[model samples]
Target: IVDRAKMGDTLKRRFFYDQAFAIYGGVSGLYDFGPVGCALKNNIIQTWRQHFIQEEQILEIDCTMLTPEPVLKTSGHVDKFADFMVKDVKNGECFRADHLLKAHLQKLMSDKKCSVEKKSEMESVLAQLDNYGQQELADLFVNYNVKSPITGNDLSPPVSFNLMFKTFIGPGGNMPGYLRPETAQGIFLNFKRLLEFNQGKLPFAAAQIGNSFRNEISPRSGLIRVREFTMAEIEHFVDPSEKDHPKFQNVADLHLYLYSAKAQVSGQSARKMRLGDAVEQGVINNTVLGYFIGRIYLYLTKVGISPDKLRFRQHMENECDCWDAESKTSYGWIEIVGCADRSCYDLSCHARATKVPLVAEKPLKEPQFEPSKGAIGKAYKKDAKLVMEYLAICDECYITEMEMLLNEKGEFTIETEGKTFQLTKDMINVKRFQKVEEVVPNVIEPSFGLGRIMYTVFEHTFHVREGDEQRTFFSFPAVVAPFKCSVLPLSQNQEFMPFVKELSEALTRHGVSHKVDDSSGSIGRRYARTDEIGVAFGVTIDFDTVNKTPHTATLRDRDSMRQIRAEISELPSIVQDLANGNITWADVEARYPLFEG
Candidate 1:
């Protein structure tokens, strides 16, 4: 039901030809956004920016999609970011190891011979097979006896599949590079510049919304699963010592549905609770993470996603390294938005790899006493150069420890490459050096899978009238609709062409996206095309404009195909009001006459 049009034999064939590039033997896992698809995607991304970036005032950055190999190596993508891939020995057709196993078993359990209880058990296990480690996943094949669909042979062991698209960076293959797997790493790499731009402030956020690539083993499900797609990510860097968000109080009373890990392990669905209670009882780790989760819920609802279909599924321990296992959060959270408490991992890693300082610092409100009077110079006169070198190369924490030990015992032992040197009272001096040092700020990240959100939006807004198979349509939000209005000229009348063009131009000038359909197709056929792309309103220019006193046009609503006659000048405001979902067709008709010729 969801993918009827796209999957329809005839429609699918036409769509790939008309919209995507396939003439030159189209590339697998690569598809161009058609005119209609591009508009819909733009609407979705713009709506997302309004909710997450603009409304939240989060700093947005446009980073390069092409990444160097060294950056990814430091980020751990070179080694750990991989999918389980399996291939058929005979056909040479590769398959995502996990999906293949699950899909096969699901089809098997659906057979009539299988009992309902056994089918249910199979479904539960299939859904959670990713929760298992290598050994556990391997044991499942023996436990369930899952087989390949093509040859009915036992599937081979899972192998790591790197999803990056690698290429030479410059001439002669001197440098290697890759297309980014995620947008988060770009922001993480720019931590130093961002910190300096903000005047060395802590608790700031950087956001990025753009295309990312993953060489999917088998890219299927149309837009739902694609090689290249959009992602909206927010990296909220905050002091780990103060993880509390400033706006947490505003959403404390909001109710949230969470599918925790414990529930899934125990074969149960999600549960609902208030934000305040969840945080108080440690269901959510901190205020910052909870705040974004709440905002995500609100944003999803605002963009016409059904609240029932949306849930803040918590990350299971295995799914997320930052997850708090004591809370028993689950993997079902779908991770549409990953709000993680990454504790100084990104910055610290970069600093370590590049030999640069990546820590945040704050000045003390009150200065401490400083009794330093040549502590190193006066202490080691005979071997000053050696002792000074040791002191300079000492770790920050070690220096603090040595200061305390010297203050208490009038002597301290310092280690130097397996050799111990003692500094006695005569050869050492202790003092307090009041200075502010650098500290790495923790990150609170919120990442969204744009395609997944789009799917959820479609599911939420999708509806069909009872007993009317043809009435199915996506009731997307007016702001996010591909076209705000569709201009239709009845019967392609000569007198209506000029008026239709003028009206379309006016709507465009008013920042309204409008399409003029002058094709030879019937009005019903035209309306179907507009509806498919989720146009909110339509205006029909008919012969009425030639004879009417006010030169009126018929404005029709998409959700309800009700038409009303209004003066051409009044069309803009009427369409605007209707597009905003402020007044219904009934309200507009109550004031304006209904079109019935």
Candidate 2:
């Protein structure tokens, strides 16, 4: 709480981001990233590419954000992508059922007068928040006396509210669509091309960096929860039989802060464990999952999340089926990334929807008799593919039963995704055919929330100077720092102007993102503001810099407040080296003469 309050001032002061449409009383869950925030985001994205995509040679793609309805409907969004909204009876205020119930119980748990058993019961309910269905939630709301947050009014029955921003495709408003809720489905829709792009191989990954949307019932916490956000998602498709990753060994030795369900249930803290041991000992399920977890840890720490403030928590509850990369802040341990084993869910969903053969194949050594696909269509529509794959995978015995029913009843009824499809015998035929080994690839995805991570970086590294509560700074790593360096000329003096221009040109020549703060202010004041923006390094053109013919200036470390005198010409390379992680600030601090003034 202290840290959140502290960082908010700096965030607003530096304009890292702000509520979107602020001029007319800004909307909730919407934000516009300002200059510094944008730069930091871009840097983080580039670093992610370098760490995962380039290192692993993963195929990178830019997918469209406006996805059609059929695609998401097949991906299970239309039917299941919704939250239970319990509206106010009197004022029409809406609230998520589980959220409201959880809040009500949490407040009860916090009461000093409450008994241990009641608190325990409430805590149990809280743990089961994600598992509660609509009726269960409705019952809980009444049982717990959950009331409307706005007016303490009686709440209506819980109803499902779709989170998608739906829209029409054409002018006639006939074709329906929704803004994409995730980037992975686009990859699944193009799975065939991606597989072929890999030359019909297994164990390949496709990465996408794109924006996704959601209509949050109650978006809070500034930047943590937003209506629209950028996501960096990688869908690694690998054969389920072979779960091992060749590069797993590369990061095996890396140790991470691991929070297992056993530890949580036992009321223990996360313990530091080696990655390989975690995999080998079954702490983490498989080598592939562990490899990506380690890589995500590496990426997060590299982008300024202190290892002490990060942990890989095992999926405890209603989370996606995988590990969570949680970064600590005043918001507590919020999930910044989810690395999940999707296990062919999306692909199977797509295949079951379109009836497209998305499975990989290898020729059989000996010809094997397989049931032929009747390819039910026209009448079935979306249900057609589901029935096709159902029959497509039928063995000889199951084929005989279906054929028996086909001829006896003149139709075969197929059940899938909660519907029944009866294909008439006239529309289908059964025949003997030889086929190859067809296998659906399981997907291991590491999806990153860029906004959550940025907020994490802000809170985790946020600092206050000694005895100066108002003066704050962020200790960001040089790589993803908003600016590589901040050039501040002393007092806006004319003598410092030439040095500032030379330094600016030098920094810009090397393609470093920087800003020259020549505004009227004390050098200390300028340094303070620059630090607030989280510039990695500082260049100050003082009296000594201007008078010196050889052209030397004092470079200050943003966090350390330590300065070093170096020749102006060598400034860019020095800053570049530090930013690129080629050399440490300690190395630069060692080579150059230390300047106290």
Candidate 3:
């Protein structure tokens, strides 16, 4: 088994990252990335930008981290963004209720002394843990005699705990505000401006990469759960009537491991299927959602996440809470990203709350006849204008049926404000006119937790050398590795200075990020250091280059430890091509002879 604690120790010793506030005894769920960690994270984000922003042509925006209370209230964060918590009765220490239940139940089920019937009941409760409310969780604690694992004391009843970090916007606590819980809400709030920016198009996407926060009752699992972290979110707005994507065919043939809703309900494992087939057979809701799922799989794999360890687990209908509930499932599949089809819920809520018209207007293909005002004004007297305006935008079928009733009965009864009025056929004149139809767009959102993704990538790529347990390294993709190459000199002698400087300059000019290791260490030690930090290639400036008639340098591969000799003049082009991913190591070996020295 891979030891995560050992990997964490390695990271800390190498200055990849460490817990935050270390001098003050450190805070849980917080970390400060050192130089190497920052570089690695930035490189990963750069790769993300290339794949999603540039290639996908998504409009990128940067929004504020502090959000006004009204915006969040409109987005339903004020009421629903929370988790259930239970406290230790004696010490008042808090524990997340669902987590507490899960941990204790799992322990009980593992004990040999537990009866079969009781274990079966615990299993049934665990399967639907998220479906339970506070009362049910409290009842479970009473029935099972659950106590605090830390103190073995009785626990208090469960209560809702809002996860958002609340604060005042101005002096004297006048205006209420909060740190944004998710990045998608900012995009929704700016929907009108973005729609105008896109020239009122139906299918345009807005992406944002920023920091968000949540006050967790418990934060464990390293970077997997944190108080503050980065997120990459895309909100694709398309007309509700037209849910099809124009570029769906681009990802149709991509295969995915999908733990679908049906499978979840039936308690089965994920099944692999082509995205096109999944959409055609109605396994996935629509083409737009399936296309993005395929894209996410491709992106994660390209950044070194093991495809076999990743699966798209569909959310249950009730598991789609703003926080907490979705992750407490029996299946051990954690959600690193969520792709939800928020069907006009966000826009409709915001529109209703703000009384703003956050709607798109489409030109109708066929115009309809609208009742004229003069004929109605003579009949209804005071209420003529209101009735005429209502009839103008009313559904065509309703208007058609009303007209047929008037023709058949010579009069029709219309109700307004609980007052009845009789309308004759001559009381209204029908006029044909062009019209614009308004619709609320449905949102297809794909939200990524970058911290979780980064952690998963580390776990997936980390490996130890065969028969050398102490020597471990991450085999990150060359494109996403923190430093593409490291320049090492065999000696610290003054004679090697010019060549070292020359190589460093060449790498800089070629946009290949590199480091120079000239400290007092053996060439092997320096190579090991570079390898541990995930540098893909190493260039050593040795005495042979200066001693020989024609200068040549040795290029070493990090994973293979194989060396190839090439002329000093050709080294820059070779390293540049390799770092840019234009050529692989096989191509480099094909072009140059292997160096035994």
Candidate 4:
């Protein structure tokens, strides 16, 4: 069995991370990373930047952490970004209502006193937990006889708890500002500027990596549920009419474990399918969405996350207020990274709220002309020129409506600039114009919760040493390991000290991070300490180098605990190649003689 407490203890003991403000009674949901933890987190983020920003050629931007209230209000965060919470009547401690109901229903289902019908009902309620309104959640609390887990008292009615942290921007507390709940809104707010930067392009992506805040009702589950965390988000803007990605073909054959809406509605398990087939069969809405889904799968697996534990779960429709009802499911599958095809909703909403033209224009393949030779110029002599000019530049829908009116009633009236002009069909000639198509680009957003991903990485890489349950280590990939190599002196001998310093300096010169363990301890104990912290390679400088003419060192692999002897001169390139993923363990083992020491 996987023991989270054991892992947690190890994390604190090794200074991977610990609760923040611990000296003054630590706060829940806030954590501080130690040196090793910070390095690991930084490496993970660096890998993320390489995969998404550098390789994909995405434009990255850093936005403000504090946003004005009006900005969030326009993005619907002020009204909609909230969770239903209920408080203990006696203790006044608050808990998320949906989570409370879910836990209660699950417990009831497992109880012997629960009847078959009751268990089925409980299961149904648990599945649709996110779909319920506050009133419905309150009713469930009363109906299911749910009480506070802490105080065991009757709970108050459920109410919305806004998750954004609100504060005053400057003096006098006049201007209200809020910490952003998600990074996507910042990207959306800058749509017009980004569009101009892209030269009015329809298919481009912008990525942001930043901290977002959420005032959680109850923060638990280590990094999984935190009040403040880092988010990595990409907003790929594409023409709504052209949702297919140019790179779709490259990732089409990649297989994914997909918990599609159809399968979720039918209560079926996630099925493995190639992304191309999924898009073709309409399992996924479009090619761009499917491409990102495949890419996310590849990224997770590359970062050492177990593919078996990961799956793409379709977001249920009713859970989100913005999406269409038919697109979602009520299943219990969790989302680590959500790839959503937001159909012009984000830009459209912001455009409407801010009265900004967050739209792109595409030049027509051919100039469109409607003949307007006689109609306006002859009938209304005084206003004829202006009316004809207005007709030429009017929207296609308005022109079509005018034509229908002229054909049906033999006349049409157009009101422009406080003037109404009535015209007969013969008075107006066909309106000729150059046509341009304007559209709000649809967004394919791939959002990542970095803290959740970091926690999952820890879970997947953690394991016990063979035949030794007491010893544990993280089998991280070399590319994402905190330290690429550790330089260990076999003893405190002066000769070993010189070799250690030279090797450490050599590794540093090659840009490989190395830790020096020169403390007075057994070599085995030093190796164990390095292994526990996920140091990929260990270089041991022993007495053999002091006595021998041609100096050499023993390089050890963390996972296999196998050693190979290499000339000190060749160590830098070999270790650099291994750290950069240019070479593997087998390559190194084959090139060098196995050291028996």
Candidate 5:
């Protein structure tokens, strides 16, 4: 396994990413992606859009990262979005209370002198760490004898540290604003419109990709816990009665590394299990949640996260319908995405806050509110009887939707006898029966930290060629590579330049992203440079290419470092398919002769 030091060095040297504002001593949690990093990140996001947004026709929205005070107060962020912190009494050094306690427990557990009963107790406390109240957390510090890691001094009691970056809006400054702590709430506030946009349908989803901010007391582990980072969030709203998804069958057969809540408490390792069986045996709670987990798994692996190193972990000490997609790396299991069944909490909270009925409807066998026949008769005159009968027999969901539209828009339309009738809210005071009910839609949120996933992908795909430790590179999947292909000439010669120019133009015309590394370096050195930034394929214009009958070039695979002889005319289309995931390396191998120089 490559150490993080080497990974960090490579990331900096290749300019994949580095700390932001470095000359000013750089903030701990802020980072700036360099050219390679930007391309790789963009490619990953494009894949995400295709995998989820386009595939499922999820409604995608761009919401403001700046949020007002009232919205979050209702969403519970103002009161509860905080971390428990403790400080050294002497040096005033600070640390997250849970991290300190966890470290202490882990240290003790590793001790040969520690008793089994004591180890078990420490493990239990570790499992239930997030469930602790303030006083409970304080007790953990005292009971565990937690101290400052750096100073080795007495520590202060745990205190709440809010994680939002606060800001003021407009010149008046009367309005208090916060950089959004999460992207889900942005999707939540637009629930009504999105539901309407989907024709008031249940099991619809809205996605938002934007930046969020958190004022971390201590930012650690590179991108794992950053203060400002991009987030891609999806809120799948479903009916409370039916949590099953129609597309669940597609992902049901997928086998995944699942770490159940029971497994965590029992100290058992995550096991590979069929996702369908997991839902069938009541492990994932519902099919909707399981289906998402499977998709998340597929996306993660597609972007080059090693399947063996990735697992879906249940949250600690809680049977709450929440999960974290954890990818194992040099840092061990790190959470990249969170999938949760948030129930109706988000919509209901926003609905109460804004006085907007953020809800969905279903046809009921009976309606609670009867239509007023007299009111309909007064408005429609001769059409009153027909309208009354139609309203009376209408299903509950239709009436429920109509009532919402009327209440909000003050008018709605109906179709009868191939004629459209515009109905105002005043006409809906029916004294007769209707069949509709409104319900707050339950939410299944799959929230992703783009930086965290990128970092994991970097770690999981890092490879060092055998017999040469200096030949380190990232084996990023073609779809997510920084560049799909790189063109390298064996020498800076007139003969080689033509082949290089021809191949470059062909790749460009074929819409393949590539770079030409005609810089001062040997062929091996240039290939290394290309590989380091994870360009998936390389076309080398060598003497053989200049003299060859078919105008052929050597196509090198970054991961395998193997070459296949193919005509220059064929390389662009092959690279395109490789980058788009339409074809595999094995297919290319089968069609071309292996080349070695």
Candidate 6:
């Protein structure tokens, strides 16, 4: 059952109650994690760190979010990272122009105003909405006769809205800069350095988990669509020829719920398949992407997310506009993680833009064939010195008019030093050398929206118990629960203080995340509150401890609502085992004989 009101209030109220700077009207698109939120988020991240970064020994990097202007320009974000927006002609009410188009199309389809032919065409266009060109988007309005929802008037031509937040450095507005829309650029710019660190390896990954900003046209869906959010991105640099993963066999048998682009176009949902099957059938583009997706599924499950609710949906071709490869359409494919084979685009682009040797150089095993032509000394009598230097970098694949001019004419025009310079063949020597060295690295990128994953977890873990009054709690795993346990001194009796303090201290010292609640509230009330926040277990110190020999306390399980009395010394290990799912509370109850309500 979904507690919309409670969940909504819990999220919003907690943000206000615990986060700083909310009192000063707060900043748009920025958020401060409250104490509880911080703890939960850290636990979630720690689990990810263990599974993906540490256990696998994936290379990790912390990159700068403040990017230089030229870097973004080369990546195409400065020119193309934008959304459409439309402002009302009369009232000046701004609207996300694309959303308006979507709503209009949805309405026309629902109203059945479109003919069958028009409907089919409209459906096809809408299915490829993510990749529609500007002209195609314009044609939709003309074909559908869509109007503004608010004004009942014609909408103006859609205009692009650049999403980057621009800033200037120093006392004057001199050095222009922009906030990075994604963490990828940092990884790209530092490619040479990382490659060096890895001893000039052909296949190595550099991962960054950090903040990224994109000014969304209209942010909604609570935290799911925040403008400022954490991103965990991996750039697997490999030789373009060798993208096959060695460890792919380990996750090949993992089950996956796939929604391909074709199914999406035909209005179907996800289809279940094994990760290996998907790769073998060419459904997933590569084994690297499938391996990461498999690990993601496991991580989601480990954090108490229902596996049934999870799916690995393929991105439609339009959604993957940044990549050169075409994607097959699939139903129910929404992009929360973008796992792509970015073929040498980042490194090559950076190298071209900066005019630097960004590629790694490796010596060839066999000597390459060389071509020593006849027109060297005949063309230039004076400066054969400079001619030799120019031919060293030139490839021997071409003998076109350009090469003829270079060989015959004393001087040939070339673009270098940002200028066209004429050089005499006297200053150049022409020769083709067989492969002595080469460098062109490939990239496999896996990017995750941290906010979206967190929301998905919240949705999947939410449930209601029978006979409860609209009460709900997150079925979060003990490993990722915000607080592993809560300590409740039933009556705050003076005799119980020693046990309560000792228990809390012991749990804390063991690196167990726990909280103490000695307030004068009913034990049930305290337990209810803790459960609502997803605490996995509860320890109650009561008079039973003082009255009974070999004093013990009641250990309450949140999900089961069952308790068993255990000796004070044995409480930590029992609670630890129960929280870790090593033993069941029923087993403890059966063995102890001493049970509590």
Q: Of the candidates shown, which would achieve the greatest lDDT relative to the real structure?
A: 5
Q: Give the C-alpha miss distance for residue 205 in model 5, angstroms.
A: 0.9
**Model 4: per-residue lDDT, tens digit, 386-438?**
66565555544446667788789887875544367776754444444565788
The 10-residue segment with the lowest total lDDT in model 6: 321-330
* lDDT by residue (tens digit), candidate 2, 1-597: 456776787787678888899999999999988888888899999999999999989998888888888788777789999989988888788888876887788889999999999998987887778888888888888888888876988999899999999998888876789999999988888889998999998889999999999999988878888889999999999888889988899889998999998887778889999999999899998889989998999999999898988999987755545889998777778999999975675676566556576777765687612322444555666666566566665444435666788788877665555567766653444466674687778779999999999988888778888854568888888888888899887756777787788788988988777898866778888888888888888888777778877888888889889899999889999988888878888999889999988
The 10 consecutive residues of candidate 5 with the worst lDDT sum are 425-434
TM-score per prediction, in order, is 0.78, 0.88, 0.85, 0.85, 0.85, 0.84
lDDT of each: 0.71, 0.83, 0.79, 0.78, 0.84, 0.69
| Candidate that beats the other on lDDT, 2 or 4, i.e. the better one | 2
Q: Number of clashing pairs, model 1?
A: 5
Span of 10 residues, lowest total lDDT, candidate 3: 321-330
Model 1: per-residue Cα lDDT over 165-283, one tens digit each: 88878787757999998998888778888888888888788899898998888876555567887888888888877789888988888887877667766778878889889889887
Compare candidates 1 and 4 on TM-score and give the better one: 4
- Ranking the candidates on TM-score from highest down gives 2, 3, 4, 5, 6, 1
What TM-score does model 4 achieve against the real structure? 0.85
Models sorted by lDDT, best on top: 5, 2, 3, 4, 1, 6
Candidate 5 is scored at a TM of 0.85
Reference-based TM-score, model 1 = 0.78
Candidate 5 lDDT over residue span 114-141, tens digit each? 8999998987887677889899999888
Error of 6 at 372 (Å): 19
RMSD of each: 7.9, 4.5, 7.7, 7.7, 9.6, 6.0
- Which portions of model 3 miss their true places by more than 4 Å? 320-332, 367-434, 467-469, 492-495
